[PDB]
């Protein structure tokens, strides 16, 4: 409950701070100040439109590498086992497999962006 | 190929280090004598109770007490 | 424990109901699949921690692995769908009937 | 008394943020052949309070195109996470003793990204969304290396607890065993926190203040102090991990003092680095941190798996 | 001049030193001349629950000795 | 596709089911099914057209839900009994949900709506694998748990598959959908008997594979995908009409061909358990399954259709495509009934 | 269907050690050598017979031998042992390594005597 | 299984962590180890249809260990009767259940 | 604090319900994140730290990619919040109310056996080992490197081949 308490304290700090920021100052609202910036001129279209991402393959392989992290992360407990050879070989195999996949992607120009 | 590696140590030395360290990690466990004491140390750690054993009357090599001569002397872990 | 297992099963059923009952988009369907994965993970993990079966604890990591690979290929198919039609909607995919 | 402990952990960190702003401005000044603030206080030791007060007296902007819920909630989350990250920090005795402190830190930061990434979306505008997507790319770049670096480093500590590193470093630093992992960790802490040269989300000359262009007041201030708090956190992490100070069970305040010294050095190093170099490109960052850092990171992880074994140096589980 | 930065650095350092010494002394004050116990495994928690139930007062940090 | 990729993908396709057989944990079983899922989509989507994208999306999105349902069944069994195997004294709801999801994986009615679509959206190969090799592990699940299934929905689904496959193939001019509805009907015949001597389910499976693979090859030899394209076969490669005819008449089970053995012996083992009228309905709708095969083989072998002027170029040039296994598989179908006691 | 048998309160009424955990971690290594026979008999019964109700008396002998042990430590070598465990209880994980000089006093006392 | 390739070669790729009483990483018993062991040792040599009714007592004990429904019912009944009596004023809880005992060690 | 776990489970149910109502993938990803957080918290409540932390990490790293995608593909001019549709808002309110009524119903037709409002918090942990060491979650997962090394290879093959699959689908 100590940790819950610390987090609630930080939460309430942030919310009290926002309450102050909103209800302490003065307001003069009108449509010409509440509309999006776009550098002095007006936008030509909405921002809720497609933004083509040109690193999507990199995103997906980041997901798979995240899973590889999740598999590598038990090693500090895997080392206090009696075998210490099966874990060695298996971790070697996992890392080498990941490196092989990275190399295939690299050579096939997956780390390059879709111009 | 020596010239190729000479070129790669100048251009792209990050992958040279990587392959070198990979091969070193794979080869050095085969070399050392200390490699075998790792499993032995992980085994020596008594995380669980050593459950005693019934005296059948035919257990000479098994000790009758903790600090008897018999059993695995862990002095190899001392002064390793 | 029986309470939370009931609730987790109902959560699975809700996410399944979701991914079955389609709307326009497909990304939402993939997210419903991720939610089903997550509820299954938590069920497995809680059963393993209750029973103290540390031998089965490698199962939920496998669930996450394969579910994330599933998500990956789904998102790649979504890339192709957008490159074809442009807008992610699942109603434009109506030309195999003919 | 736990609440008094919360105070003694939270308010000095906020004063430290506030005066880090001053130190940044003045160091960048003197590197730039000028004197920074020396007016508002004797040597400008009131400019942070002035900035805060002035920011909380300005009228906040609630635009029309915005999603007000995410808009107001993102700075809240930002500061909350920046301020909860200081919780398990052993300096030397922590406030909250967790057994998986580094996983808490990692998850908390990967969630801290979502402040940027939802404020940018909620603030319906172009440069805002640019900053958001650049944050996505940045996190894709750095998270893998951060995790595997930290794994390789704690693979000679034996646990994810932060307090065990103090005993791992009772007679030495982890910088001499792992200076390469330390380099890459430093530059990933530099990619995290959105700090120059890896800024790329408030990149004033590429974007016009991304993910804050629509934020004016205390919300923007919250983002600001969240950034300047995460800076000190990451310096504290580097100096707890690699630059292990002296514990001396009878003299723990010595640990606290050397921790202070090293954290100040590394934070001033962040400011130095802001002053010295130009900015990367958010695709060049990917190319760097995938094609140079991840190969060597995996290779050195293999090395640090082999090393406990062929040296008989497997650490203990508590 | 560059020595005009040391004031802010000094406030910053005095502020970063407090979270540590403060936590240490609060621990020693509540638990009593003793570091706050770490219980990373269930065995340490068992020891502390024991020492609580030995005390006569629900406090694990009285340390009954050979007077019993 | 470069060779490394083909090696990886075909290894994965082969190892999905192989993991599914040689595994007592239901979870590694699930893993094998997911390898079969993941590795199929690249080659479904290889030609990169909207039809292929739609086929792959439909396949993926239908199989993911079935996979999650199987995982639910497995996790509920683990909660109930603390094991990774469907014992007896499990819950019929768990077992029936497993059956439902496996039927969605196979393509059985009323979960059949995706198979003909997907099959039309992909080449002749990737229809062969999809209809033959992907059916083998999902069937292995049921075969391993045959004394635990409810003998009621197992038969209602079979009957629906029979009826709907017959009626759907009645009116399909496209051949890639005829093969799909044939798959539906034959999986119906399999699943009907699966609680009753599952050796016969594997018999029907092997017979069905041995019939479909050479038929797909026949379609491949000229890339025939329509009744009008297979009808221009008395000019292009007319030495194949004999085998095509006998194979279609084995598929629609007629006695002197070995494709009648599975239906006959299934009816036998179903009448040995007083499942009479169900078998009657099935045997009487297999006739409608035969009708469109008869229409097809009229169109291609007995009433030679008009051809084109440009089909003489095909006669000038020569061919190499028959892989020498079309002959063996077409002749081991259509002529192996007298060896039926050695098959059973 | 079958009732569970359980011992009475007075089948558990026992003279307890009433002794803390650092005082006990300090004398662990001597309590493992002395008072090992009874402890190992109790262990063998507790694991061979999977019932606590079948071994209460071995537990009572365990408690008795421990009490005799600390009575020896009290009548002989009480001050050095006091200093040892007092310095040991300061730590948070109760580490022997931080108190390595009071071990010497306690061990030399308990060696020259007994 | 379908293709017993493991039994052919004697390996155990997956058939050694099939249930609870199976080689936990360090020798920590899972709960219902004894019950599951006893059920499994009854249902050996037999297959299925005969074990489901010759080894029913042991499965029922296992099911009560793992899911543990009848003990919930028993404690719920005891609690309900206690609340009824305390509402009527008949029961008087003792010190060693109100929060005031003499701790044993 | 006895209703802690029930509150966490109910919150998870609501997160997955708001997910199943399918607003834009932004708020769907928000729901995934909140529900993964809640899942982590209950996995900790049952005595597991590693599994919860890893659910949290994986789902965060995944919803990052979902944001990057849905800004490009699953975006509209009006992303359809929960409040955007009176019908969705009605089904959400109705789902909360229906699950509450269902819990209050099954707490009647069975005194206990499926849900225990009366005894709640009394059945969570089920025979803890009060004296123990080297017992947390992480030893069981680290068994992927010893005594369960087929899970490790099969997972690694899934990831490895998934890379090739990604490249081929995208090409
Ligand atoms: C019964 C199925 C009848 C389906 C009707 C097929 C059909 O329409 O005929 C094509 C007909 C087209 O006429 P066509 O242009 O003169 O045919 C060109 C030939 O392919 C020209 O072929 P070719 O020039 O290459 O050489 C002649 C060819 C001529 O052979 C053939 O092409 C067909 C022979 C099949 C005879 C089956 C009769 C039934 C036998 C009962 C057993 O080969 C032979 O000489 C036959 C050798 C002896 C028979 C070998 C058959 C072994 C398989 C046995 C299967 C039995 C199934 C019953 O229409
Ligand atoms: C969310 C997690 C899933 C939980 C189930 C959903 C329960 C909350 C739904 C409430 C309906 C919100 C909605 O319709 O969209 C409105 C808004 C969009 O706002 P808007 O764009 O319509 O602007 C509204 C303008 N004013 C203020 C003038 C009316 O979106 C949201 O509310 C989603 C934000 C998260 C909601 C959860 C808040 C938790 C509180 C923590 C502080
Ligand atoms: C505008 C709204 C913004 C909301 C922002 C919310 C910020 C959440 C902060 C990120 C939290 C993510 C990480 C999860 C918490 C840490 C988990 C952990 O490992 O420590 C939990 C701790 C016990 O864990 P452990 O250290 O492993 O065991 C010690 C045994 N002696 O002790 C526990 O088990 C209890 C942990 C409870 C965590 C509380 C979370 C608060 C959520 C409130 C919202
Ligand atoms: C079976 C009963 C079917 C009743 C149909 C009710 C109509 C409906 O909302 O379901 C369809 C809905 C798809 O939504 P949509 O196609 O966009 O309809 C237009 C809405 N603007 O489907 C969905 O959006 C998914 C809704 C899932 C329901 C979750 C809540 C369950 C508790 C009530």
PDB file of C-alpha atoms and ligand atoms in Angstrom, chain A residues 1 3-5 7-8 11 14-15, chain D residues 73-74 76-77 80-81 84 96-101 103-105 107-108 111, chain E residues 38-41 45, chain I residues 4 37 40-41 44-45 48-50 53 56 136, ligand 3:
ATOM      1  CA  UNK A   1       0.000   0.000   0.000  1.00  0.00           C
ATOM      2  CA  UNK A   3       3.519   2.098  -3.506  1.00  0.00           C
ATOM      3  CA  UNK A   4      -0.181   2.717  -4.117  1.00  0.00           C
ATOM      4  CA  UNK A   5       0.176   5.669  -1.768  1.00  0.00           C
ATOM      5  CA  UNK A   7       1.395   6.856  -6.901  1.00  0.00           C
ATOM      6  CA  UNK A   8      -1.825   8.382  -5.568  1.00  0.00           C
ATOM      7  CA  UNK A  11      -1.538  11.595  -9.263  1.00  0.00           C
ATOM      8  CA  UNK A  14      -0.682  16.444 -11.095  1.00  0.00           C
ATOM      9  CA  UNK A  15      -4.459  16.876 -10.918  1.00  0.00           C
TER      10      UNK A  15
ATOM     11  CA  UNK D  73      -4.571  13.633 -19.230  1.00  0.00           C
ATOM     12  CA  UNK D  74      -1.240  13.339 -21.043  1.00  0.00           C
ATOM     13  CA  UNK D  76      -0.685  14.309 -15.825  1.00  0.00           C
ATOM     14  CA  UNK D  77       0.602  10.896 -16.877  1.00  0.00           C
ATOM     15  CA  UNK D  80       3.214  11.040 -12.631  1.00  0.00           C
ATOM     16  CA  UNK D  81       5.554   8.571 -14.298  1.00  0.00           C
ATOM     17  CA  UNK D  84       7.139   7.504  -9.750  1.00  0.00           C
ATOM     18  CA  UNK D  96      10.117   1.143  -2.114  1.00  0.00           C
ATOM     19  CA  UNK D  97      12.236  -2.019  -2.210  1.00  0.00           C
ATOM     20  CA  UNK D  98      11.210  -3.940  -5.322  1.00  0.00           C
ATOM     21  CA  UNK D  99      12.785  -7.152  -6.566  1.00  0.00           C
ATOM     22  CA  UNK D 100      12.303  -6.217 -10.253  1.00  0.00           C
ATOM     23  CA  UNK D 101      13.171  -2.533 -10.153  1.00  0.00           C
ATOM     24  CA  UNK D 103      11.472  -3.871 -15.156  1.00  0.00           C
ATOM     25  CA  UNK D 104       9.452  -1.258 -13.273  1.00  0.00           C
ATOM     26  CA  UNK D 105      11.668   1.443 -14.787  1.00  0.00           C
ATOM     27  CA  UNK D 107       7.670  -0.385 -18.261  1.00  0.00           C
ATOM     28  CA  UNK D 108       7.190   3.038 -16.679  1.00  0.00           C
ATOM     29  CA  UNK D 111       4.329   4.061 -20.800  1.00  0.00           C
TER      30      UNK D 111
ATOM     31  CA  UNK E  38      14.417  -6.529   3.096  1.00  0.00           C
ATOM     32  CA  UNK E  39      12.125  -9.499   2.477  1.00  0.00           C
ATOM     33  CA  UNK E  40      12.867 -10.682  -1.048  1.00  0.00           C
ATOM     34  CA  UNK E  41      11.840 -14.288  -0.358  1.00  0.00           C
ATOM     35  CA  UNK E  45       8.986 -12.660   5.642  1.00  0.00           C
TER      36      UNK E  45
ATOM     37  CA  UNK I   4      -9.313  -5.686  -4.347  1.00  0.00           C
ATOM     38  CA  UNK I  37      -2.025  -2.901 -16.501  1.00  0.00           C
ATOM     39  CA  UNK I  40      -0.329  -7.232 -14.354  1.00  0.00           C
ATOM     40  CA  UNK I  41      -1.788  -6.035 -11.069  1.00  0.00           C
ATOM     41  CA  UNK I  44       0.938  -9.738  -8.855  1.00  0.00           C
ATOM     42  CA  UNK I  45      -1.979 -10.164  -6.467  1.00  0.00           C
ATOM     43  CA  UNK I  48       3.476 -13.289  -9.844  1.00  0.00           C
ATOM     44  CA  UNK I  49       5.646 -10.317 -10.774  1.00  0.00           C
ATOM     45  CA  UNK I  50       7.524 -11.308 -13.926  1.00  0.00           C
ATOM     46  CA  UNK I  53       5.570  -6.960 -16.006  1.00  0.00           C
ATOM     47  CA  UNK I  56       2.653  -4.817 -19.626  1.00  0.00           C
ATOM     48  CA  UNK I 136       9.226 -16.923  -7.498  1.00  0.00           C
TER      49      UNK I 136
HETATM   50  C1  LIG J   3      -4.259   9.956 -15.011  1.00  0.00           C
HETATM   51  C2  LIG J   3      -4.093   8.530 -14.504  1.00  0.00           C
HETATM   52  C3  LIG J   3      -2.611   8.177 -14.573  1.00  0.00           C
HETATM   53  C4  LIG J   3      -2.356   6.807 -13.935  1.00  0.00           C
HETATM   54  C5  LIG J   3      -0.870   6.466 -14.038  1.00  0.00           C
HETATM   55  C6  LIG J   3      -0.581   5.140 -13.350  1.00  0.00           C
HETATM   56  C7  LIG J   3       0.920   5.023 -13.129  1.00  0.00           C
HETATM   57  C8  LIG J   3       1.286   3.581 -12.807  1.00  0.00           C
HETATM   58  C9  LIG J   3       2.795   3.474 -12.610  1.00  0.00           C
HETATM   59  C10 LIG J   3       3.411   2.363 -13.458  1.00  0.00           C
HETATM   60  C11 LIG J   3       3.268   1.040 -12.720  1.00  0.00           C
HETATM   61  C12 LIG J   3       3.729  -0.084 -13.647  1.00  0.00           C
HETATM   62  C13 LIG J   3       4.495  -1.162 -12.885  1.00  0.00           C
HETATM   63  C14 LIG J   3       3.570  -1.983 -11.991  1.00  0.00           C
HETATM   64  C15 LIG J   3       3.810  -1.680 -10.510  1.00  0.00           C
HETATM   65  C16 LIG J   3       5.115  -2.281  -9.981  1.00  0.00           C
HETATM   66  C17 LIG J   3       5.023  -3.792  -9.845  1.00  0.00           C
HETATM   67  C18 LIG J   3       6.097  -4.309  -8.886  1.00  0.00           C
HETATM   68  O1  LIG J   3       6.933  -5.041  -9.290  1.00  0.00           O
HETATM   69  O2  LIG J   3       6.121  -3.933  -7.539  1.00  0.00           O
HETATM   70  C19 LIG J   3       4.890  -4.103  -6.917  1.00  0.00           C
HETATM   71  C20 LIG J   3       5.012  -4.374  -5.422  1.00  0.00           C
HETATM   72  C21 LIG J   3       5.458  -5.814  -5.211  1.00  0.00           C
HETATM   73  O3  LIG J   3       6.222  -6.247  -6.293  1.00  0.00           O
HETATM   74  P1  LIG J   3       7.656  -6.981  -5.976  1.00  0.00           P
HETATM   75  O4  LIG J   3       8.706  -5.933  -5.739  1.00  0.00           O
HETATM   76  O5  LIG J   3       8.062  -7.857  -7.135  1.00  0.00           O
HETATM   77  O6  LIG J   3       7.491  -7.897  -4.630  1.00  0.00           O
HETATM   78  C22 LIG J   3       8.106  -7.456  -3.465  1.00  0.00           C
HETATM   79  C23 LIG J   3       8.011  -8.567  -2.440  1.00  0.00           C
HETATM   80  N1  LIG J   3       8.494  -8.070  -1.179  1.00  0.00           N
HETATM   81  O7  LIG J   3       3.808  -4.134  -4.731  1.00  0.00           O
HETATM   82  C24 LIG J   3       2.593  -4.520  -5.317  1.00  0.00           C
HETATM   83  O8  LIG J   3       2.423  -5.633  -5.678  1.00  0.00           O
HETATM   84  C25 LIG J   3       1.462  -3.512  -5.487  1.00  0.00           C
HETATM   85  C26 LIG J   3       1.713  -2.665  -6.728  1.00  0.00           C
HETATM   86  C27 LIG J   3       0.541  -1.741  -7.000  1.00  0.00           C
HETATM   87  C28 LIG J   3       0.863  -0.828  -8.177  1.00  0.00           C
HETATM   88  C29 LIG J   3      -0.065   0.368  -8.092  1.00  0.00           C
HETATM   89  C30 LIG J   3      -0.432   0.943  -9.450  1.00  0.00           C
HETATM   90  C31 LIG J   3      -1.279   2.188  -9.207  1.00  0.00           C
HETATM   91  C32 LIG J   3      -2.320   2.381 -10.305  1.00  0.00           C
HETATM   92  C33 LIG J   3      -3.245   3.516  -9.884  1.00  0.00           C
HETATM   93  C34 LIG J   3      -3.881   4.146 -11.118  1.00  0.00           C
END
